[PDB]
Design a protein around this ligand. Structure first.
Ligand SMILES: C/N=c1/[nH]c2ccc(S(=O)(=O)N(CC(C)C)C[C@@H](O)[C@H](Cc3ccccc3)NC(=O)O[C@H]3CO[C@H]4OC[C@H](OCCOC)[C@H]43)cc2o1
Ligand SMILES: [Cl-]
Ligand SMILES: [Cl-]
Ligand SMILES: [Cl-]
Lengths: 99, 99
């Protein structure tokens, strides 16, 4: 699809058996989601944005589906004010900026 | 151009006669630059991100070139970790997300 930027680019993702809304975010290196359970190993991480840092749990090799597009990657979970899909997953679905 | 997302989508911008690097950021509503001087009067704004809020100075109707594409619009100045070009100016240069 071609996604306009007149509005926030929100999409539905499927992750950990759940459906969530998230922002397609080219300024985010990593995908960050609000608190949720995910299976498997994790390690603590600090990530920083406007306003400073938050502590998150880093889960690797997590399956996700975005717009019918399956991918796998790292998902950071913690107290983000909004769910973001970052570049680590945007690449996998073949997402580009065009102008 | 078509910009993939394997690396950060950093571009050169020109503002007030000077070149800077900035991140094309579809997750940002607004454009926020590190401390600098701009002309005219400014208004207050608070903007929120991953780690909380920062206070910025809002300047309106500022000419800015982004990858050579001319825009004129609102620029926020404050203690952002990186220069970000948000949707207010991405729409002026005709930018979309595609996959
Ligand atoms: C009301 N109007 C406005 N306008 C406006 C404009 C902007 C912002 S915003 O910046 O808060 N932000 C909003 C979004 C999170 C919803 C935009 C987002 O794309 C930031 C941009 C950014 C990029 C670099 C550093 C800080 C911020 N990305 C980000 O947080 O990424 C995190 C997760 O991955 C990592 O990769 C980059 C970061 O740091 C990794 C390297 O060490 C730092 C880490 C809110 C605004 O509100
Ligand atoms: Cl990854
Ligand atoms: Cl590619
Ligand atoms: Cl504007």
């Amino acid at each position: 699809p071609q996604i306009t930027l007149w509005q926030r680019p929100l999409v539905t993702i499927k992750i950990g058996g759940q459906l969530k809304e998230a922002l397609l975010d080219t300024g985010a290196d990593d995908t960050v989601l609000e608190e949720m359970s995910l299976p498997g190993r994790w390690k603590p991480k600090m990530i920083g944005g406007i306003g400073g840092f938050i502590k998150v749990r880093q889960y690797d090799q997590i399956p996700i589906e975005i717009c019918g597009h399956k991918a796998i990657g790292t998902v950071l979970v913690g107290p983000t004010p909004t769910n973001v899909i970052g570049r680590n997953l945007l690449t996998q679905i073949g997402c580009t900026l065009n102008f």
